């Protein structure tokens, strides 16, 4: 009954636990939990192998990139990119593009390793994307930073912005797997797994094989990707249980139709809820603007655009009475924030958009 | 039945891995699973602060010392380490006693952070403690760094260096909780949970509070003591599985008599399989000194003391047949080790010992 | 459990189904049964119209085209449109597609009326849809009849013809509201109900108001479009409760994101089991062009293109134990046909797949 | 307060078989599926029809040698049906048809468009009796006669069989199907909407003796032509599954309440309640049909005078709705009002009429 919009960790397919479960005490017969698989047994060698086959056949990654799996998080990231590819120009420049709280939070993080410069001017809100003609690239810059998709602000890219040839890192952790990439145009892609592709502990990289072997002298091997791409993910002892569970999730997406499908599903559930704030009177408040609008998480506002506190609170409390968790906005925003990634199937949105529609036709005047 | 002797991940309570299965689908009743639990709710709350308790508790840590669960396994610590505390003194310098592989890989990744300088000579073999008295040790140096447990070599602490006051680091992922140790000795304790204590993903870092601040600029945050300090390993998404699986280990071994109970037991199944080898008249070899033999990992030779690759083979495929597995040797040393964790019970040593005494009544000549 | 892949009547919306059973007593509050409701009253007034309505808006319907809802089914217009249309020129002369056996039928049918020449030549099997250039078209006949969606062999129209300016008339029963359509470019669409939006019973009948009045002396009344559209369908007592199930389904696809979200599950759905069947290595044998593939019903074949009837007999029996009804192939082709109606849900397709898979991976060779 | 429905048709439904429908509304006798859902050509439909044309025939003994066809198109449907299927019986393609009222006459006109229809008697002034059968002018030549037994907006019924000479006899039972016994073998078609006494709208049931099949024109649609349907079972097409499984429900809801012939005495029992109260109104209700030819099952009457006073039987009809008496009001070519007494009216509902009219007549008589 229980209808999981949490925005990271995030609900997994009930049909993945259910495996999960089955199994946990005797993997396939071999007689031992995934938990206690040895990382350099010929088993779990073909899970990580699995895994990674997975990840290049459902994004169609080229052969000329490396898929590596990380521990850290996405956070581990914001420091892992400058540690590897700040040095590819001896400037140590590089540009970050703030959309929300997630690149903004990297783009501070990337100071401890170079000389960070922001691409645009600071917005009173993030409710948009800054106009990519609009962008002061440094044509000296070791690369160029973005976050796909903001978790807290609900700012989504639906294009692949033209950087001038700079090589394009990307965050894409709130929508990783949610369509198909082109994975060509981009030199670092990384995404905490659990969001939209399994549970935490293990972050994906995607890197270019021939931007390796700029790191840093100060880049822990851990988080080096030419040691870890050089070791295939097992340098040292990877999060066993986190790529196994995430190898199940990959499956699951592949049954179900791929990229395509995720983000066919993606407009259908979105829409389902973007169509109730556009028609809501008011009601409902989404600030972002129509063309940044994100299909991952959508962040809106009850009453008026600042929020009836008392409004909001009993939207919350039925929401909690009727089964429907984690649908309190972030911190930074408040309000209420609905994640639609890929396991939270269309009933799901369904059983929010009656709710929304019953809670306005009893609350708005 | 399956006999895990596995060195890393290791095998976990049937009493755990019980528990775990069954939980899977609805933590408690809360209506998801561990895997869907987001960090920021009440429920991970209790979590996380439950293992934290267990933690203090089992090795009666002072409340002067800060435990937090970091990314990264032991070799991620092999660079925080020197990023936290290198800069404590201005000279950059630290003490490194290696006592096998893993404190030489510590030591050679310490080198990218400052100037590191072992402290006794290089011994021909890791087979025995340099005698701490012919200990080399600059008192300008920040810290001292050395491994209790050598899980290639066998060769382990059994009391607590005397650095002449200096801050101490240690190394116990391979006995961390075998035994009670003082931990108000020490300056930083870092363990991998996934060989005596949980499952891969997380490690364990004890850490004196006066020692905080000192990080230098390249520290990622995810692996700043500091940081994750003030947010109680909650400053990203930390390994909420890889924690809850700890919690639950932590448990078992506080239900079993605790530290106190955990190197009793240890003593029984070392001795066991050390009194066989000591009485095969050369069958069996182990060149380590007996006073620095490990109670966790056992490694030795069969036929000779240089290895009779006949015998060991024969000995691991009748081992395999018998479901004792993960019993050949690192990949480095070769032979056979034996890792006797704490979840290998009393029985899972006698089958080895009943196994390695009637396998050398059938090839002693 | 129970999955309906019927092929019409099929499957109805679960929610649909739980208010139509909730006010059958008691429709609404007004104190009376829909099936004791008079067509006369203002109360169904507000049903047929609201009906309407959604037939318009999630169509797209043009306002110089009529709405009627008539009895007779799909068979109905069979007769219905030639008593109505073959005497818009004077040669009673009419062309018709026959991409299958709904196509064949309603060939068969006007020839009670008037002089009907097949345009293309006769295929050997419905496993194509005949190039449209090579259709031979008569400048004066009175109409160009097609199906759309041929539901015993799976031949679907993805595309709208070009019949040099004559009125075209479709048959849509089996995919009505399954993709935008171009009204348009149409002069009479007609569906029975029961296939993808609502219950047999009813029929919808969308004709542009300036072909009624062609209507033949022998067309009766209640079939006659120019006097249905001129009664608001209420020449004679309509199916009321039919018309009020459908009422509901309309409200139920819009809810779900209308046409162009009918269309995208439909892909997703079709596609599950096309890459099954094309994958199967020649154990599922599909004849139907890759180009013209329906996306709403798919006959296979299993072990042969012929078919091995002993192999299709425990296919239809395990997936009979298995709660999956109405699977078995229409009577004249046998085999399999699954039918994928807007009702049909992914979790539905997805055990269906899962059984065909497993299937295959115990009885191939 | 609750419901009393004088629906005309569609029309009121045993509440017993609403709370079966309502029950089995998802899960149909454990099958897994509802009947909106049922396959047509599953075992599990083929049982609701099978069991629907059984009933048909034990309660109105239906011979062996009748046909029982479940049609969709209603009765206006079957006034094309009849003579697509049996004008064409004798060359003349002439058919007679007996005038009585409103749906007898829509059915003479609509039977112009497929061949000569004669009215066998001369026109009536208004509808308020049967012309003696004596009076009637019946062409030997003749493929059939038609004629309506019960009319459902002037109230006037057959309480007889006319005597056709031995012509195809065409019967129109629609608003008194299964209120009384019927000799099927005096007919050859008899046809009937099951919204007004049998069902639910969507279905039509017709009884063919099986010796008129395969006269249809060319031009009657298949799913209309007897021959074809009759061939079928009923499933030449889809056929309306759930008013044919509501039918069945309402059909064993008269067998249990004693069949046909106690429709009949409870016929009689309403309608003479509503009869005796409006002969001895001393004219403030008016009904102008004649005694011998009133229906049992539409009573349709002027408040006031023959002509009706609007104020008075506008009052009527609003101190009757907000007591819960539903569609009292009369047809609209006629208006007045009219009491529609089908089988789900029970007597508890004309007695709540038959006070209702007393207690308006104590209050606004002169
Ligand atoms: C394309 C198309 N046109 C007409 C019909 C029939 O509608 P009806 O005339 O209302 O039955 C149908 C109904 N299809 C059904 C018909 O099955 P049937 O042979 O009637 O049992 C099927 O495919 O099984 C249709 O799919």
Same mark, same amino acid.
């Given at each position: 009954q229980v209808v999981n919009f949490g925005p990271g960790p995030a609900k997994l397919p009930h049909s993945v636990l259910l495996e999960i479960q089955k199994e946990l005490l005797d993997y396939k017969g071999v007689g031992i939990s995934v938990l206690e698989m040895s990382h350099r047994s010929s088993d779990f060698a073909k899970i990580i192998n699995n895994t990674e086959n997975l990840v290049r056949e459902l994004l169609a990654?080229?052969?000329?990139?490396?898929?590596?799996?990380?521990?850290?998080?996405?956070?581990?990231?914001?420091?892992?990119?400058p540690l590897n590819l700040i040095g590819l120009k001896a400037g140590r420049?590089?540009?970050?593009?703030?959309?929300?709280?997630?690149?903004?939070?990297?783009?501070?993080?990337?100071?401890?390793?170079?000389?960070?410069? !922001? $691409?645009?001017?600071? /917005?009173?809100?993030?409710?948009?994307?800054?106009? %990519? @003609?609009?962008?002061?690239?440094?044509?000296? =810059?070791?690369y160029v930073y973005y976050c796909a998709n903001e978790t807290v602000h609900g700012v989504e890219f639906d294009f692949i912005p033209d950087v001038k040839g700079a090589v394009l890192v990307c965050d894409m952790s709130s929508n990783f797997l949610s369509k198909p990439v082109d994975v060509s145009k981009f030199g670092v892609i990384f995404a905490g797994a659990q969001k939209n592709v399994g549970s935490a502990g293990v972050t994906v990289? !995607? $890197?270019?094989?021939? /931007?390796?072997?700029?790191?840093?002298?100060?880049? %822990? @091997?851990?988080?080096?990707?030419?040691?870890? =791409?050089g070791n295939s993910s097992?340098?040292?002892?990877?999060?066993?249980?986190?790529?196994?569970?995430?190898?199940?999730?990959?499956?699951?997406?592949?049954?179900?139709?791929?990229?395509?499908?995720?983000?066919k599903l993606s407009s259908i559930k979105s829409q389902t809820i973007y169509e109730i704030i556009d028609n809501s009177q008011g009601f409902y408040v989404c600030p972002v603007e129509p063309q940044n609008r994100s299909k991952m998480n959508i962040p809106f506002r009850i009453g008026n655009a600042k929020?009836?506190?008392?409004?909001?609170?009993?939207?919350?409390?039925?929401?909690?009475?009727?089964?429907?968790?984690?649908?309190?906005?972030?911190?930074?925003?408040?309000?209420?924030?609905?994640?639609?990634?890929?396991?939270?199937?269309?009933?799901?949105?369904?059983?929010?958009?009656?709710?929304?529609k019953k809670f306005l036709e009893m609350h708005q005047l």
């Open positions: 990654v080229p052969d000329n990139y490396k898929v590596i799996f990380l521990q850290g998080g996405g956070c581990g990231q914001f420091s892992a990119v420049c590089a540009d970050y593009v703030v959309t929300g709280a997630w690149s903004a939070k990297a783009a501070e993080e990337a100071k401890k390793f170079g000389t960070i410069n !922001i $691409v645009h001017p600071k /917005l009173g809100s993030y409710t948009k994307i800054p106009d %990519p @003609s609009t962008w002061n690239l440094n044509p000296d =810059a070791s990289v !995607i $890197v270019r094989d021939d /931007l390796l072997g700029f790191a840093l002298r100060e880049c %822990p @091997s851990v988080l080096e990707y030419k040691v870890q =791409a097992l340098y040292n002892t990877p999060p066993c249980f986190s790529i196994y569970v995430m190898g199940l999730v990959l499956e699951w997406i592949k049954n179900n139709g791929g990229a395509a499908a995720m983000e929020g009836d506190d008392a409004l909001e609170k009993r939207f919350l409390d039925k929401a909690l009475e009727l089964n429907m968790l984690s649908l309190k906005g972030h911190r930074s925003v408040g309000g209420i924030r609905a994640s639609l990634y890929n396991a939270v199937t269309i009933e799901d949105v369904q059983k929010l958009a009656a709710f929304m």
